[PDB]
Structures are given as C-alpha cells and as structure tokens.
Nucleic acid binder design. Sequence first.
DNA 1: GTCGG
DNA 2: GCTGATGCGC
DNA 3: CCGACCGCGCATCAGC
Length: 326
Amino acid sequence: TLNGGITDMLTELANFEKNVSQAIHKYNAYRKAASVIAKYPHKIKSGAEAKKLPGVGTKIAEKIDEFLATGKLRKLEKIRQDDTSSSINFLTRVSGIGPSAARKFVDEGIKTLEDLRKNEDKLNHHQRIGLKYFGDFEKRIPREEMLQMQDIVLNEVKKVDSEYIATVCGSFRRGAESSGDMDVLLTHPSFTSESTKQPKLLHQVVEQLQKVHFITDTLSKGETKFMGVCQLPSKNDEKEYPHRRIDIRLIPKDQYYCGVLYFTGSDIFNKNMRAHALEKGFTINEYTIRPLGVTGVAGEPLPVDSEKDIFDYIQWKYREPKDRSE
DNA sequence: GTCGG
DNA sequence: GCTGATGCGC
DNA sequence: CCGACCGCGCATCAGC
Ligand SMILES: Nc1nc2c(ncn2[C@H]2C[C@H](O)[C@@H](COP(=O)(O)OP(=O)(O)C(Cl)(Cl)P(=O)(O)O)O2)c(=O)[nH]1
Ligand SMILES: [Cl-]
Ligand SMILES: [Cl-]
Ligand SMILES: [Mg+2]
C-alpha cells in the first residue's frame, strides 16, 4: 500500500487492455509494472524513479508523473466515462464471461446484472453458476475460514483413501491472511507419470465432498482438474457462509514438486520464473522441468526431489512460498 | 508496453 | 464420432 | 529496430 495509488492505476489499465482492448501483452506489461512497483520499498516520487525498475518504461513513467501530479489519470477518467468499456469490464467479472463473450453480450443489449439474470438461457453452464454466486465470489476468504475448509477437505479425502494427499496451495500456502479462493493439489500413489492404475481418482474425491455438502456446484470437471463451488457448514440459527470457488488438481505423484510449485504461485511469480528458466535454457510446467535442445526442443524431464531442486536448475536462490507473492 | 540483442 | 482452434481459467 | 512475451486443462465450436 506504499505505492497503492500507482499500482491500482496500473491494474485498472491492465484490466482495460485485457477485457476491452483484448491486448494480452499490454495487460501483462501493466501487471508486471504494477508487481515490480508494489514490491518497491520506497514511496515513489517520480516516473523517472520508477522507470529505473525493470518492467517500467517511458509510457508508464509518464503516466506515473501525471498521477503523482494530479492524483489521477485522464486516460482512465475517459475509460470510466465510456459506456461500452464500462459494461464490458463489468461483465467479465462474472466467472465464465471473458473479453469476447462480454463484448458479444453488450452487442445483444445485455449490459447489466439485471440483463444477465433475465437472459440465463443465453449463458453456458459455467456462466450461469458465475452469475448465481456473483456477489459471493467477490468476497475474500479469511485465513480462519481457509483453515476450516482445509480441515474438511483433508479429512474427507482421507475417508475415501488414506493414501490420498491433499495440499492447499495458492495464496494460502504463501501465508496470506485471506484468499480469493481455495486451491487443492491432490495426489494418489496409483496415479503417476508412469501409469494410471485406478480410474475416477479425482471423481471419487469430488463425489465425497458433494456427499457431505461441501462442494455445491461444478463449473467444469475432467480427469485431473475440477473447477467448482464449495461452502462451509454453518451452525443452528447462524447465517450461512458465502459460497466459495474451489479448484482441485490431480497431479502425478512423482511430479508433486513441479505441481506444488505451479499451484503455489503466484501467477506472475510463475510467469517470471518460467521466463527465467527459458533464458537459462530450461522449460518449466506443472509436471516437470526439461532442458531446451540446441534447436529449442524440450528434452527429457530432469530429476527433481524438492522445490529447491527446480530453483537450482535455473540458478535462483530458493524463495520460500511466502516470498513468491508477485 | 517493455525489453534484449 | 474425431481433430484442431478458440475462449476461459488456473 | 523487432519479435518475444509461461504453459496447460476443460468446454465449446467448426469442419470433416
Ligand atoms: N503458470 C501459471 N500458473 C498460474 C496462472 N494463474 C494461476 N496460476 C497458478 C498460481 C496460482 O497461485 C494458482 C492458483 O490460482 P489463483 O487462485 O488464481 O491464484 P492465487 O495465487 O491463489 C490468488 Cl492470490 Cl489470485 P487468490 O488467493 O485470490 O486465489 O495457480 C497462470 O497464468 N500461469
Ligand atoms: Cl498486446
Ligand atoms: Cl511434461
Ligand atoms: Mg487461489
């Protein structure tokens, strides 16, 4: 919050490029600049001071001087006044509605929450659930509640098969005092990169959590990735908790470390780290880290026995989860 | 929009 | 039906 | 300059 004004402005600009302009690289440039600045231990005094940081260039420098001078940015001022842009940005806030669908909805005269509700027929499954819990998904999750959720998930999974290992990742594993949702990494000895000895490994867990009424809805579901909704049980007479977004990712047991690295994030941390790996001649995904051949083709997976091993391969000093929040 | 070669 | 591209999300 | 910008699972569609 030291440079909150500036980072907020950059994020708004990032969201505009992504949602309205559909310019992903500009979106990421703004996000990176915001990220690099939010980590800066000094209260920025000029765009010049900011341009010193990698990720901030001439354009963002100028915008920072304007913001520092007036306390706002005219470019954004005009974007907020723009109806089409305003409507498109709003609609993308519904899970399942992206830049394309939002712009398409606006063309059809569907621009508001009221319009969406009276046009459910025009939404796919994911979008319907997104609209259903629109308000709830905007809410933050206190770490206290994350702990209760963790307890339920780990205990329910244990009941299905004592061999399952569920790990809560995302901002929770990074030590955040609140999270936007729950991310669960799941492993089972029967599912490795070498073979899938038992089917429905993910399904069984999903089924068990729906059975005890923890999982309430599904946005999408496959062999290794579940994307849905959950809710903590409330006591008698007490208002019920808000519904929460939950993702469960089944990863090969022998590829746990690359999996937990990926799922722990942050997303920008992953991007920076993956980009650095490339520069160092390696490629990283949630399954492995492989070297890049002379022509640029990925090679065979390298042995990994801890998250640190991955960091060493790319010549990075180990960074604890709590320090990966970029 | 920013960056490295 | 399958394969490939695209949207969307993590 | 100028092109590279992380990598991938699921849902949906187009074309066959
Ligand atoms: N490589 C890669 N990994 C990603 C990406 N997006 C997400 N991940 C990985 C890294 C992410 O940590 C993880 C979970 O996705 P979230 O739940 O979206 O991210 P959280 O960090 O949990 C959070 Cl702070 Cl947005 P919140 O607490 O509010 O949920 O997935 C991406 O674009 N790329
Ligand atoms: Cl772009
Ligand atoms: Cl792989
Ligand atoms: Mg999360």
